[PDB]
């Protein structure tokens, strides 16, 4: 067996497509080379058959179709955002409040 590495367009590759699926939980998926984190959710929109993945105004993967299943999934990240602390002076007391 003689191989040619990085001398032709990619035609033959191995089984790198993961095993299963997880819904309602943000995971670091890899949709055929597109790695990102988001919660897989069913999308109301209709996808044309030739389309592979969707892009929002931010030019980021927010929708995608499965490489094996014709159904389409949405990429929405799980709970993110900053946290703020409301506290009085340290000379007065020490109780604090947490606001998201």
């Amino acid at each position: 067996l003689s191989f040619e590495l990085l001398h032709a367009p990619a035609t033959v590759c191995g089984p790198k497509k993961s095993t299963n699926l997880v819904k309602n939980k943000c995971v670091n998926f890899n949709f055929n080379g597109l790695k990102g984190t988001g919660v897989l959710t069913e999308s109301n929109k209709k996808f044309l058959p030739f389309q592979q993945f969707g892009r929002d105004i931010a030019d980021t993967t927010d929708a995608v179709r499965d490489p094996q299943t014709l159904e389409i999934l949405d990429i929405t990240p799980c709970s993110f955002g900053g946290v703020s602390v409301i506290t009085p002076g340290t000379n007065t007391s020490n109780q604090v409040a947490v606001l998201y």
Binding site: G33, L34, K35, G36, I57, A58, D59, T60
Partner: protein, 49 residues
Amino acid sequence: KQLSSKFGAISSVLNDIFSRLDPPEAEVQIDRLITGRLQSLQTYVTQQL
């Protein structure tokens, strides 16, 4: 929209860069991308000021 800028790198996505290029050599490209993003953020901050 400035997040999707190449900034002289091979691609605007960094996980693919880390997967296809080892972090020893991809560190320079990642540094260039993040400093371009920081320059854009500083320009936005100055405009907001």
